[PDB]
Ligand binder design. Structure first.
Ligand SMILES: [Ca+2]
Ligand SMILES: [Ca+2]
Ligand SMILES: [Ca+2]
Length: 316
């Protein structure tokens, strides 16, 4: 879609059974715990059109999803059945949707709203993982504020009641550094720039203590054979939900192939997958000493988890 993303748009958040207008000053910022509807009006190649994007946050509940279905059908009917429809889950946004916020990164907060609990309040200390894809689309995703959440391939923003830090992983790109800066703007905080490896003591303290985190030779490399996750190939950002718990998945990071074993995958799926990995590495050229590392659901090592966009240790 060559439309440039600058058309007029309206964004609503599913709240209970209704769609509620989102504060226009915050378009581009979303709660991962919620579902949203975006009505985008555009004019391109001399013709006017509309697109309804249904965006489902990674933690949005099934009842919100069911509510959006009703809301979107109503909107569509209201509009005379003219808009183009596109359903999108967090992390799988098309380039055109990412372009709707004038170059700003899509920011995804933890929490959200619910019938039973209403709107959650922001935590006092927060950490955001900022990652951009090859095309440059950038996402700032809030995660738990612990040292273990860091990964060398991205930029991170840590905000506390008393300080802000922009941590730059060794493999982070300028797009990630720039998105981090924009996020800091939204958070109204001035950061202390920190390069991975020369963190001041105040940074580790804010995170509750220094600890090992997600790193490896590949995660540290700025360059980037981008890692591919193959189903028992998964496009978009690598999300924890892409790991089929009843199956076995392969994550190829070039100098290493991980064999991820779902808790409910049958024994034979691991066997086949291992056989396949060996062959995959020999189909090609590379090295025959390419390690094939087996990992089990819930016991993933940091060198594996680092490739994911914002992992939740309790996800399962
Ligand atoms: Ca919600
Ligand atoms: Ca990165
Ligand atoms: Ca299976």
């Amino acid at each position: 879609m060559d439309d440039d993303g600058t058309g007029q748009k309206q964004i609503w958040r599913i709240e209970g059974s209704n769609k509620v207008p989102v504060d226009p000053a915050t378009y581009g910022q979303f709660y991962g715990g919620d579902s949203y509807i975006i009505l985008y009006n555009y004019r391109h190649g001399g013709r006017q059109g509309q697109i309804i994007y249904n965006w489902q946050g990674a933690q949005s509940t099934q009842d919100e999803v069911a509510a959006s279905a009703i809301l979107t059908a109503q909107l569509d009917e209201e509009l005379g059945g003219t808009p183009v429809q596109s359903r999108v889950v967090q992390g799988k946004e098309p380039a055109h949707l990412m372009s709707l916020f004038g170059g700003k990164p899509m920011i995804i907060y933890k929490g959200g709203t619910s019938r039973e609990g209403g709107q959650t309040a922001p935590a006092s200390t927060r950490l955001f993982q900022v990652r951009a894809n090859s095309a440059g689309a950038t996402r700032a995703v809030e995660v738990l504020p612990k040292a273990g959440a860091l990964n060398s391939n991205d930029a991170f923003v840590l905000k506390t009641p008393s300080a802000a830090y922009l941590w730059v992983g060794t493999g982070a790109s300028e797009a990630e550094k720039t998105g981090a800066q924009e996020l800091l703007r939204v958070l109204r905080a001035q950061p202390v720039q920190v390069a991975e490896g020369s963190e001041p003591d105040g940074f580790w303290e804010a995170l509750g203590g220094k600890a090992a985190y997600r790193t490896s030779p590949r995660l540290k490399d700025k360059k980037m054979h981008p890692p591919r996750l193959f189903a028992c190939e998964v496009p978009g950002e690598l999300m924890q939900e892409d790991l089929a718990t009843d199956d076995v998945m392969l994550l190829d990071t070039w100098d290493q192939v991980f064999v991820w074993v779902g808790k409910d995958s049958q024994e034979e799926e691991k066997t086949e997958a291992l056989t396949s990995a060996k062959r995959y590495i020999e189909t090609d050229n590379r090295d025959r000493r390419t390690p094939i590392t087996v990992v089990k659901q819930g016991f993933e090592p940091p060198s594996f988890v680092g490739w994911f966009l914002g992992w939740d240790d309790d996800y399962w």
